[PDB]
């Protein structure tokens, strides 16, 4: 189990692979929305975060992230 | 008579490239033989002083042992001259990568040509000069007497009013660098006046150096096409043997 | 007047704005445009304020060059060699394909190569007594390069403090390789040896014509400069150090003769007589038969630097610069009047700025209601100041170069037989 | 016993080009459209008849090269 | 920083529609390599006519030259007194098997979009 | 009328804010910086923070701490600073068991592959992703990830050039987000 972000030769190899440009590559993804169409629970208001670009933090209203599910992954 | 026409003289400027087909084994053997001859020439030059008798005798023995062309015989000299030509071209192909290798190759070739020229008869020198592209100019006797004192004072291997029975040549000052460097020639309005022996030796050496440098630079553009699977181990081994 | 370096920036700005001859500079550095992209490849290297060094600089045309010097106001300007690509874009070419091709042959002469021969000044100072050294050096080098070699166009530039440069800007000279330049420098040298060697000149029995003519040139200046002004035989230490270059068998005789002698002229005559007498007894001796000529060569011959001329990508100070310490102008030297050239009379930047101010004040009442371009204003400004004869000499040299180019073009047309 | 692929490619290309040029000159055709260029009008193409499989030729597996 | 290399079809370069000093990127098929003077000649066949582009390659040697292969040349155009126009190559890459009609279609699409965007000003 | 920029509070509502935008290099050089927050630019009202470019390397410059490259996209030339990752405290290999030895060999192979992938010279094709910055009155991209594209037939650049106008028309040439409709 590895938790790169969020709240041993094998570990080092996996860590190196997960950050090399061999994985971070352009792909073609066929996805399906995780929240099923039948489900109904719209209750999400916009959040507020503190992005800082020029050593000058500012506040913006951000939308909740999009959750997907994979069905097929192909190279290109 | 293709045999004598192809190789009429022991001395060469290596202008015409070879055009026949040879086996791989002879190719490798010629390359190895010429690199050994070059190393032997360098060692003999460093150990002894250029000239003398022991140095030239050992050089002659080395040339004879490696079945090359050094002397002048009327019968059966096609093979040594052909081997010298092909081996020199192969070594030129193999020695065109870096500046240091080019400088070393040019130095050794110049020394070998100087020796072969020093062991040549006079009429053979004149014929060899005619055969190659060089053309020289001889000043008139009136000019010779007009500038006798200056030439004798410069003393280009001339002592005691030895200007008589000699031909003085007129050449641009950019070609007599060896003599021009250390005040051994009389310079006037952009031309150098040189006696016969010094002019032939030094000017032939300098012209050969310039031509060989230009041709090696031209051949440097070639090995980008030498992707042949053969000749590659030979070139790699010979580069850093 | 004493130069105050704290006033340098304003005078520098005014000089680069109004008095610097951009037109003649671009005319010289272009060579008529016979070859495409010649000035676009010339490499400059400026030194900004507070010792900031930047090289690999190039410009597209005269206006860009004017704008760049006006904006940056450099303290020093240098000229490099012509490359195969624009120097400011030297990283956009595969390594090994960016090499210097052409540069005019140059020479350098300095005081610091005479501190052990001269005594009138101290260290890095100059007095009207020691400028005869540069006069003789100029004459010797110019005669050699004009007769022995045959180089037509030459420019002699006062370095500003203590030296003179020589810009040989012919057509076939620019294409010479490094080996030929090193050969030339070796051909033009006699004083050879390190610091630990006392006798730095060795003359053989046979005398080269170049050395003979140099000696004949030296003799016209040697007496007044050496015996009268320098007084190289005044004290015990003087002839003691001179005695280091004479045969060891006549030390006591020469010392006794010098004690008998009174002035420097008498000592020189006694030395000449002693050398002449000893020359008849020379039989396989280390010392040659030319002691007097060897002494003259050691005490008067110029010494050149091989590093300045051997390289093909070297840098030298450009003409019409400003010395950061004294504040003079690298003015061209006229060859016809090289004897009358007084280094202390070279106009300073402050003096020419004051003259420009006076000229503007006069123009406030003499030249009014004229809507002329800035080019004509700068032309008048540098014409009416003390800088006029030097730009005239520069123009004469440029005219000679233009005549040579026209003659070469005419010869080429004659070869083509088309008119 | 010495063959290289570029030589074979050159020989095949030269044969195809020469025969096609002769045919075009005899039949008075204007130009040959490139194979991969799409168009909505009739076009004249030149090529070599081949098979995409290792088996025998048939009326369903013909490819023009 | 060098000027950008805009695309130009060979029959536009060979027709003198490019001003002097402009930076261009073209394509063609190699035909010759004169090693003595380091000059390369390219043609591209348009319809039934052949147009030539000359490329001076003094800044890219050493070089492996294949006769009959497509090439893409990026450099600056210079007009000469007698040799017409020659491109001083800075980067000369070998591409073989490129779908040329697709490339021309993409070039025309890019030009059309640039014209459309520039039509609002 | 001077078009007032979008308020700095509603910037996050745009989907383009958090995505690596595909833009022409000429556009990257021509967009106007936003006064509210430096380092974030505007294109047709869209607050763009990161970019994605692909082009041909025309110049390589190296310093002690970073690389420099010039990416040419046939529309303009921009610099691309690529920082150097310090290899401090390198992993020490040990003669462990056979499976662990195979794992270490595979790790070394992966390291060699990465080092080969990150080697760039003049004339290659490079893909650069990062954020725009201004330094000494010059606009340049501080690359986050970058690698050398192996494109021997010129299909990737053709696809990019065919695709960019469509994405422009369908996304970037659109008015604004939907903030409280």
From Swiss-Prot, chain B:
Changing residue 82 to A: Decreases primase affinity for POLA1 by 10-fold. Changing residue 89 to A: Decreases primase affinity for POLA1 by 40-fold. Regulatory subunit of the DNA primase complex and component of the DNA polymerase alpha complex (also known as the alpha DNA polymerase-primase complex) which play an essential role in the initiation of DNA synthesis. During the S phase of the cell cycle, the DNA polymerase alpha complex (composed of a catalytic subunit POLA1, an accessory subunit POLA2 and two primase subunits, the catalytic subunit PRIM1 and the regulatory subunit PRIM2) is recruited to DNA at the replicative forks via direct interactions with MCM10 and WDHD1. Heterodimer of a catalytic subunit PRIM1 and a regulatory subunit PRIM2, also known as the DNA primase complex. Interacts via (C-terminus) with PRIM1. Component of the alpha DNA polymerase complex (also known as the alpha DNA polymerase-primase complex) consisting of four subunits: the catalytic subunit POLA1, the regulatory subunit POLA2, and the primase complex subunits PRIM1 and PRIM2 respectively. Within the complex, POLA1 directly interacts with PRIM2. Belongs to the eukaryotic-type primase large subunit family. This is DNA primase large subunit. It comes from Homo sapiens (Human). The chain holds residues 16 to 256 of 509 of the full protein.
From Swiss-Prot, chain C:
Mn(2+) 2 binds at residues 108, 110, 305. Changing residue 43 to A: Strongly decreases primase activity, which can be partially rescued by increasing primase concentration. The presence of the regulatory subunit PRIM2/p58 accelerates the kinetics of initiation and primer extension. Inhibited by arabinose nucleoside derivatives such as fludarabine and vidarabine. Mg(2+) 2 binds at residues 108, 110, 305. It comes from the Eukaryota. SUPFAM superfamilies: Prim-pol domain (SSF56747). Changing residue 162 to A: Abolishes NTP binding. Transmembrane segments: none annotated. The bound zinc ion is not a cofactor. It is bound to a zinc knuckle motif that may be involved in sequence recognition and the binding of ssDNA. The catalytic domain (residues 1-190 and 303-408) adopts a typical 'prim' fold structure formed by two three strand beta-sheets that line the inside of the lower and upper parts, each surrounded by alpha-helices on the outside. It comprises a highly conserved catalytic triad, a structural zinc-binding motif and the nucleotide-binding motifs. The Asp-108, Asp-110 and Asp-305 catalytic triad binds two Mn2+ or Mg2+ ions which activate for nucleophilic attack the 3'-hydroxyl of the growing RNA primer or of the first NTP bound at the initiation site. This is DNA primase small subunit. It comes from Homo sapiens. The lineage of its organism: Eukaryota, Metazoa, Chordata, Craniata, Vertebrata.
From Swiss-Prot, chain E:
Changing residue 117 to Q: 2-fold reduction in binding affinity for STN1. Signal peptide: none annotated. GO terms for cellular component: chromosome, telomeric region; CST complex; nucleoplasm; nucleus. It is found in: Nucleus; Chromosome, Telomere. GO terms for biological process: negative regulation of telomere maintenance via telomerase; telomere capping. Residues 1-121 bind DNA. Keywords: Chromosome, DNA-binding, Nucleus, Telomere. GO terms for molecular function: single-stranded DNA binding; telomerase inhibitor activity; telomeric DNA binding. Its main location: nucleus. Gene3D superfamilies: Nucleic acid-binding proteins. The keyword DNA repair does not apply. Belongs to the TEN1 family. Component of the CST complex proposed to act as a specialized replication factor promoting DNA replication under conditions of replication stress or natural replication barriers such as the telomere duplex. The CST complex binds single-stranded DNA with high affinity in a sequence-independent manner, while isolated subunits bind DNA with low affinity by themselves. Initially the CST complex has been proposed to protect telomeres from DNA degradation. However, the CST complex has been shown to be involved in several aspects of telomere replication. Component of the CST complex, composed of TEN1/C17orf106, CTC1/C17orf68 and STN1; in the complex interacts directly with STN1. This is CST complex subunit TEN1. It comes from Homo sapiens (Human). The gene is TEN1.
UniProtKB/Swiss-Prot annotation, chain F:
Residues 51-149 bind DNA. Changing residue 161 to A: Defective of TEN1 binding. It is found in: Nucleus; Chromosome, Telomere. Residues 1-179 are annotated as: Interaction with CTC1. It comes from the Eukaryota. Cells expressing STN1 mutants defective for dimerization with TEN1 display elongated telomeres and telomere defects associated with telomere uncapping. Component of the CST complex proposed to act as a specialized replication factor promoting DNA replication under conditions of replication stress or natural replication barriers such as the telomere duplex. The CST complex binds single-stranded DNA with high affinity in a sequence-independent manner, while isolated subunits bind DNA with low affinity by themselves. Initially the CST complex has been proposed to protect telomeres from DNA degradation. However, the CST complex has been shown to be involved in several aspects of telomere replication. Component of the CST complex, a complex that binds to single-stranded DNA and is required to protect telomeres from DNA degradation. The CST complex binds single-stranded DNA with high affinity in a sequence-independent manner, while isolated subunits bind DNA with low affinity by themselves. In addition to telomere protection, the CST complex has probably a more general role in DNA metabolism at non-telomeric sites. Belongs to the STN1 family. This is CST complex subunit STN1.
């Amino acid at each position: 189990v590895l938790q790169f972000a969020g709240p041993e030769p094998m570990t080092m190899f996996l860590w190196t692979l997960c950050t090399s440009p061999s994985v971070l590559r352009p792909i073609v993804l066929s996805f399906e929305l995780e929240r099923k169409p039948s489900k109904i629970v719209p209750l999400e208001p916009p959040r507020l975060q503190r992005f800082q670009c020029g050593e000058l933090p500012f506040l913006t209203h951000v939308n909740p992230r999009l959750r997907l599910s994979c069905l097929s992954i192909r190279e290109s | 008579d293709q045999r004598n026409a192809s190789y009429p003289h022991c001395l060469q400027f290596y202008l015409q490239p070879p055009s026949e087909n040879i086996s791989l084994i002879e190719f490798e053997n010629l390359a190895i033989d010429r690199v050994k001859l070059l190393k032997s020439v360098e060692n003999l030059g460093v150990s002894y002083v250029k000239g003398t008798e022991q140095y030239q005798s050992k050089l002659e023995s080395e040339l004879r042992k490696l079945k090359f062309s050094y002397r002048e015989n009327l019968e059966d000299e096609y093979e040594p001259r052909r081997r010298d030509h092909i081996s020199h071209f192969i070594l030129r192909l193999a020695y065109c990568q870096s500046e240091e290798l080019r400088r070393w190759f040019i130095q050794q070739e110049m020394d070998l040509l100087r020796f072969r020229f020093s062991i040549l008869p006079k009429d053979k020198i004149q014929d060899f000069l005619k055969d190659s592209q060089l053309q020289f100019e001889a000043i008139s006797d009136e000019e010779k007497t007009l500038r006798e004192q200056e030439i004798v004072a410069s003393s280009p291997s001339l002592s005691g009013l030895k200007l008589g029975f000699e031909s003085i040549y007129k050449i641009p000052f950019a070609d007599a660098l060896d003599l021009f460097r250390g005040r051994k020639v009389y310079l006037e309005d952009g031309f150098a006046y040189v006696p016969l022996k010094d002019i032939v030796a030094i000017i032939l050496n300098e012209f050969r150096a310039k031509l060989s440098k230009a041709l090696a630079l031209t051949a440097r553009s070639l090995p980008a096409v030498q992707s042949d699977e053969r000749l590659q181990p030979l070139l790699n081994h010979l580069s850093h043997s | 007047e004493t130069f105050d370096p704290t006033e340098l920036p304003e005078l520098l700005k005014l000089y680069y704005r109004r008095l610097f001859p951009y037109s003649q500079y671009y005319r010289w550095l272009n060579y008529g445009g016979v070859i495409k992209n010649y000035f676009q490849h010339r490499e400059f290297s400026f030194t900004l304020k507070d010792d900031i060094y930047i090289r690999y600089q190039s410009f597209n045309n005269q206006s860009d060059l004017e704008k760049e010097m006006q904006k940056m106001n450099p303290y020093k300007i240098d000229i490099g060699a012509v490359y195969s690509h624009r120097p400011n874009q030297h990283n956009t070419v595969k390594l090994g394909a960016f090499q210097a091709q052409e540069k005019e042959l140059v020479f350098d002469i300095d005081m610091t190569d005479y501190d052990d021969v001269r005594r009138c000044c101290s260290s890095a100072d100059i007095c009207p007594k020691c400028w005869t050294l540069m006069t003789m050096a100029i004459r010797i080098i110019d005669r050699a390069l004009k007769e022995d070699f045959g180089f037509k166009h030459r420019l002699w530039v006062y370095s500003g403090r203590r030296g003179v440069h020589c810009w040989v800007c012919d057509e076939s000279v620019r294409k010479l390789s490094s080996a030929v330049r090193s050969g030339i420098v070796e051909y033009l040298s006699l004083v050879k040896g390190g610091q630990d060697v006392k006798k730095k000149v060795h003359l053989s029995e046979k005398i080269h014509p170049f050395i003979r003519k140099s000696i004949n040139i030296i003799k016209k200046y040697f007496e007044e400069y050496a015996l009268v002004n320098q007084d190289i035989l005044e004290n015990k230490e003087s002839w003691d150090k001179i005695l280091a270059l004479v045969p060891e068998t006549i030390h006591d005789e020469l010392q006794q003769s010098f004690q008998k002698s009174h002035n420097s002229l008498q000592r020189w005559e006694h030395l000449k007589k002693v050398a002449s007498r000893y020359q008849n007894n020379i039989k396989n001796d280390k010392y040659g038969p030319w002691l007097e000529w060897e002494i003259m060569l050691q005490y008067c011959f110029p010494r050149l630097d091989i590093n300045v001329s051997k390289g093909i990508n070297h840098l030298l100070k450009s003409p019409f610069s400003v010395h950061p310490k004294t504040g003079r102008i690298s003015v061209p030297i006229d060859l016809q009047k090289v004897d009358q050239f007084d280094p202390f009379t070279v106009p300073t930047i402050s003096f020419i700025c004051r003259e420009l101010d006076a000229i503007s004040t006069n123009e406030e009442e003499k030249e009014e209601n004229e809507a002329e371009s800035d080019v004509k204003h700068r032309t008048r400004d540098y014409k009416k100041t003390s800088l006029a004869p030097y730009v005239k000499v520069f123009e004469h040299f440029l005219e000679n170069l233009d005549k040579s180019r026209k003659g070469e073009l005419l010869k080429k047309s004659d070869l083509q037989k088309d008119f | 016993m010495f063959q290289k692929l570029p030589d074979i490619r050159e020989v095949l290309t030269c044969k195809i080009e020469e025969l096609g040029s002769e045919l075009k000159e005899h039949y008075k055709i204007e130009a040959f459209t490139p194979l991969l260029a799409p168009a909505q009008e009739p076009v004249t193409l030149l090529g070599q008849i081949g098979c995409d499989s290792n088996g025998k030729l048939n009326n369903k597996s013909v490819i023009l090269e | 920083l060098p000027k950008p290399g805009t695309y130009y079809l060979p029959w536009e370069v060979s027709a003198g529609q490019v001003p002097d000093g402009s930076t261009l990127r073209t394509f063609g098929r190699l035909c010759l390599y004169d090693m003595i003077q380091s000059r390369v000649t390219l043609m591209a066949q348009h319809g039934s006519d052949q147009h030539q582009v000359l490329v001076c390659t003094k800044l890219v040697e050493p070089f492996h030259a294949q006769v009959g292969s497509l090439y893409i040349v990026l450099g600056e155009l210079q007009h000469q007194q007698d040799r017409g126009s020659v491109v001083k190559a800075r980067v000369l890459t070998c591409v073989e098997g490129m779908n040329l009609p697709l490339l021309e279609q993409a070039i025309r699409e890019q030009r059309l979009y640039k014209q459309e965007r520039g039509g609002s000003q | 009328r001077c078009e007032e920029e979008t308020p700095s509070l509603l910037w996050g509502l745009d989907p383009v804010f958090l995505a690596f935008a595909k833009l022409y290099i000429r556009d990257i050089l021509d967009m106007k910086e936003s006064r509210q927050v430096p380092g974030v630019f505007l294109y047709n009202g869209h607050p763009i923070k990161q970019v994605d470019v692909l082009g041909t390397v025309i110049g390589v410059r190296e310093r002690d701490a970073f690389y420099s490259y010039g990416v040419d996209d046939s529309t303009g030339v921009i610099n691309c600073i690529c920082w150097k990752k310090l290899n401090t405290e390198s992993v020490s290999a040990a003669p462990s068991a056979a499976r662990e030895l195979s794992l270490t060999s595979q790790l070394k192979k992966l390291q060699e592959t990465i080092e080969q992938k990150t080697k760039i010279e003049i004339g290659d094709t490079i893909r650069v992703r990062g954020s725009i910055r201004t330094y000494r009155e010059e606009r340049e991209i501080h690359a986050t990830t970058y690698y050398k594209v192996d494109d021997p037939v010129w299909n990737i650049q053709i696809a990019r050039m065919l695709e960019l106008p469509t994405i422009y028309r369908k996304v970037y040439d659109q008015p604004f987000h939907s903030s409280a409709l």
